[PDB]
Ligand binder design. Structure first.
Ligand code: ATP
Ligand code: ATP
Ligand code: MG
Ligand code: MG
Lengths: 591, 597
């Protein structure tokens, strides 16, 4: 009853996708709606939580309790510029708690504040349950995907979200590398050394990788990208233009109604997807804001002009990854497209022009390749042809410490293969505390603080004589673990971390897990009791129509059933027992 | 550059699905949006025909010119009851042409009439195009799917639609048989004999089939169903309830607004999909009608109560298939589910209760199994699939084919359940001396009074050799080919001689001339659409160029003059792409010459 294998979960900004691999074939799993991709929406009702198409349908109906874009918010600090801007754009309310942002929603009649790891854990629970419906067994091992440019806080937060979802995260794989698994194994193969450029432009994140494929070894030569650039930004540009036309043609401004913003955003996304096939489209919506209809024509040229800066901007990480691995465009063997936004013809024309008219490779599915590769890797890691598979990934941004004058000291440089061990020596001015950052800027104020690290047990000596060996280890998941040991006096030194972000202690993870199980239990209770009360009331009505000693016993049992119908404390099982007892008694008396 | 194989297309009431099979694996092909199912919508504009989700998304904006549900109209007569009720519910205008229904739209600035075979042909051409970008070659052979209970007029109708789409219809395969191929070959195969029950509840049609599956032999033991029962009927019930509640809460009626009915219908389908998973949902749509908002809550029990008679009715064709096949409930080995509407938990509850709580088989994909099996049979028929996989299909006729006697009383000639292909005979004779004509109506169905059957047509047999009354023996032959289509012939066993047959008051039949002309019109429409794309894109590129050289020139008299000429050419709507490009080149010579100075 327990699935001994492992599933692959592509956790995307806009859509999530689950797949499974059993050694012979990889299958993408469809949800209860028949869709192989499930939107990453989580809405909150009075008694349950909606995830997927159900949550996205109730987005305009309840924008304050419909959560989305958690991927752009997970692992970040509350006062980062991107989350301040996003928070200005998002309709739901985000609060600051001890430096960590948490959304505030109305759930189960009370106010609740959820960390991004909890919401992402809800989405992961949904995908896992899709896999469980497909397999018919309990799923507990999984491989989860992250963008290649995710920093340490984001990867650790995503993995913790995988733990809250009740999954054993066997591996955190980079999405372009998983797509490389889908392309190199599927349409291709052959022990032929080839250079593959992976261009993954999704809904919220952007990645580009350069890999060397020799048989079964996948070697990431380089990678670049932007974890806050996707199709929703293009939707934002077209949305801003449409707002300018609305306030221009009606004098009214719709900026204050999140409902109207949601409907207009949906219309702009539909128009964008239409413009990838045609040369023009039209948006017509009723009321919108303050009872003012809207009708505008959008040309493909207008969309491309509105998104020219971003479309052209995507070429900068391409030249970046090209220079970092030291290869030229003539030497790039293939260019594979991954992500929905790659369906934009302007993007493909920019990439094809950049490589001097080279034709783009589009044999793999841009929506399922990531979950495909993740599923293959999970099936291999759980032992479920392809024994030569080797994954040599890379760290995207430098992991270092803050020097004197707050200058970035890289310990693990970008482009370092993974996993790796690095070491750096510290000493005392007379505990030792230093800030660990990640990024690529010289001044650490322009980098991502991994935290303030304090070394707890130090011997008492003169200044400079103790040598403190600090070890930065980066595992196959790409996550940093630091330790400390000094060569004089031997010994070990435990480390404490303050002012961190995206991490959760084991206690908090256990608490969130138990709370999740309690939520699901309450949902099953509400649904089963609801339907049971409906059925019981219907049968009671039929019995009343039928009746209109024995008479009195019937009427009394019917009054008990009505009482159980009025009491909210009644359980579905008790309701079933009452209905069955009614049927037994009425059949005995009638016969 | 022509694909030698064949594609399998599932032509559904709501969604169509294309697939290909070459010998090893069968691929379900995704469209331009990456979707494996494309909606069966065709909307007409001033310049082009939109097919698919591009047409479905503008259903609220242009409801009078957006066409759908033609699968419930194809092969039917204008005065059929279902055609009248559906016409009362449809926003587009349907017109009777000598009894044949025809969708009338505003297209290319002029009024246009289309037969259902033409619109179905447009959908089939869209799926064919999907397969063509997938394969990189032009395809011209295909196997098209029809419901098992489709009658003779309907089958001939969709086959002619496949001809109009430019395809060579190698076979007309029944949808539960294609799903049966998907389950018997794709889900898993055993050399053990098994009785498989297939329950296909789609968007507009309903089929139940019992097949004997023995390795590679697929034998249809029986089949029943209802070609006019689907999920859209449940959406119609919920919609009618929503109109009752709206009129109750506002004292106003939206039954006259087509856009309002479309928005409410979309919200009802969405609410049904949600109710398949949860126990309750909410419909909230603002400014639905007369500036009146609409907000109600729909419970699952309310939905099931609204569709209780139809849901309970789905079990009757299952009992019918069990009686016809001579099989008890215990002897059914697997119950496979096909069609999106099968996701309704009430339906699965009814089915499982009908078989004493037996678990239903959900191994195959309920949205792609039909295109799966159709693609398999297409690959085998085209010869592209060789050796790998003994596949044999033995199908039956769904309804009895017969004539009408004195008193309009049905006399069956080919009974239901008869294996295909088949040959049956029935004798006629004259009632007077030197009689030259014997005329009889051919019907399909099971009822005794042909008033409740489907008229295949008035068949006139003439002339007859001059003999005395009741002397000639007119052997009439009802032949049913592998597609399930009826061809009738006549002979006079005395002295042989083929006797000529004429058909009148038919439906779903087209002569070769009309089909060829419809193909030509399709070519003209695609040519006009591609032309419009060329003029539009060339126009936009010329605009961008004019703006660029305005920025450049404002940083010469011939460049200004050529600019004015280009703008004036840009103001004319009848400008060709070659003329626009010629003007852009005329500018380009001047500005590039000035750029080199
Ligand atoms: N035909 C199309 N034309 C243009 N854009 C499209 C098209 N189809 C999908 N998109 C865009 O692609 C995005 C979703 O693609 P994808 O599934 O790769 O996102 P994701 O993987 O969830 O995002 P991320 O990789 O950032 O986590 C959507 O934002 C959508 O707007
Ligand atoms: N999750 C769901 N719950 C309930 N109903 C659904 C669900 N998903 C789809 N449906 C219904 O199923 C229908 C689509 O099924 P399908 O694609 O089999 O139709 P079709 O093949 O076009 O119909 P037909 O076979 O009659 O031509 C839709 O009309 C929709 O209303
Ligand atoms: Mg992605
Ligand atoms: Mg169907």
């Amino acid at each position: 009853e327990v699935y001994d294998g492992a599933i692959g979960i592509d956790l995307g900004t806009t859509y999530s996708c689950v797949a499974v691999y059993e050694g012979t074939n990889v299958e993408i799993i469809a949800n209860e709606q028949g869709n192989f991709t499930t939107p990453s929406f989580v809405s909150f009702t009075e008694n349950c939580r909606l995830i997927g198409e159900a949550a996205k349908n109730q987005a305009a109906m309840n924008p304050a309790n419909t959560i989305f874009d958690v991927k752009r918010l997970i692992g970040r600090r509350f006062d980062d510029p991107t989350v301040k801007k996003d928070m200005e754009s998002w309709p739901f309310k985000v609060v600051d708690d001890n430096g960590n942002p948490k959304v505030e929603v109305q759930y189960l009649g009370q106010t609740h504040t959820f960390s991004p790891q909890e919401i992402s854990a809800m989405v992961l629970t949904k995908m896992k349950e899709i896999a469980e419906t497909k397999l018919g067994k309990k799923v507990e091992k999984a491989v989860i995907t992250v963008p290649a440019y995710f920093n340490d806080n984001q990867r650790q937060a995503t993995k913790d979200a995988g733990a809250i979802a009740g999954l054993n995260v066997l591996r955190i794989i980079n999405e372009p590398t998983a797509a490389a698994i889908a392309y190199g194994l599927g349409s291709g193969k052959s022990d032929k050394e080839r250079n593959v450029l992976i261009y993954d432009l999704g809904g919220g994140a952007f990645d580009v990788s350069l890999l060397n494929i020799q048989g079964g070894v996948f070697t990431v030569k380089a990678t670049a990208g932007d974890t806050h650039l996707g199709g929703q930004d293009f939707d934002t540009n077209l949305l801003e233009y449409c707002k300018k036309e609305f306030t221009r043609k009606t004098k009214k401004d719709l900026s204050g109604d999140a409902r109207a913003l949601r409907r207009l955003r949906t219309a702009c996304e539909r128009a964008k997807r239409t413009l990838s096939s045609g040369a023009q489209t039209t948006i017509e919506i009723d009321s919108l804001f303050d009872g003012e209809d809207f009708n505008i024509q959008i040309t493909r040229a207008r969309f491309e002009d509105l998104n020219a800066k971003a479309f052209a901007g995507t070429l900068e990480p391409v030249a970046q990854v090209l220079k970092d691995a030291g290869i030229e465009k003539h030497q790039v063997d293939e260019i594979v497209l991954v992500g929905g936004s790659t369906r934009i013809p302007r993007i493909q024309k920019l990439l094809s022009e950049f490589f001097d008219g080279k034709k783009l490779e589009k044999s793999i599915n841009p929506d399922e390749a990531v979950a495909y590769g993740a599923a293959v890797q999970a099936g291999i890691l759980s032992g479920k042809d392809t024994s030569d598979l080797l994954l040599l990934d890379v760290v995207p941004l430098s992991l270092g410490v803050a020097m004197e004058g707050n200058i970035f000291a890289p310990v693990v440089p970008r482009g370092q293969t993974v996993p790796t061990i690095k070491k750096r020596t510290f000493t005392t001015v007379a505990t030792v505390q230093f800030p660990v950052y990640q990024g690529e800027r010289v001044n650490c104020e322009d980098n991502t603080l991994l935290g303030e690290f304090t070394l707890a047990p130090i011997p008492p000596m003169k200044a400079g004589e103790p040598v403190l060996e600090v070890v930065f280890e980066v595992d196959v998941n790409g996550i940093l673990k630091v330790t400390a040991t000094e060569k004089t006096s031997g010994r070990s030194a435990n480390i404490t971390i303050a002012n961190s972000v995206g991490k959760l202690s084991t206690d908090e993870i256990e608490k969130m897990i138990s709370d999740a199980e309690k939520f699901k239990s309450k949902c099953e209770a509400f649904s089963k009791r609801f339907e049971a009360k409906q059925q019981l009331e219907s049968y009671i009505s039929r019995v009343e129509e039928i009746i209109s000693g024995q008479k009195d016993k019937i009427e009394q049992a019917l009054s008990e059933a009505m009482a159980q119908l009025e009491i909210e404390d009644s359980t579905a099982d008790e309701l079933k027992k009452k209905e069955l007892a009614l049927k037994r008694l009425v059949t005995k008396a009638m016969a």
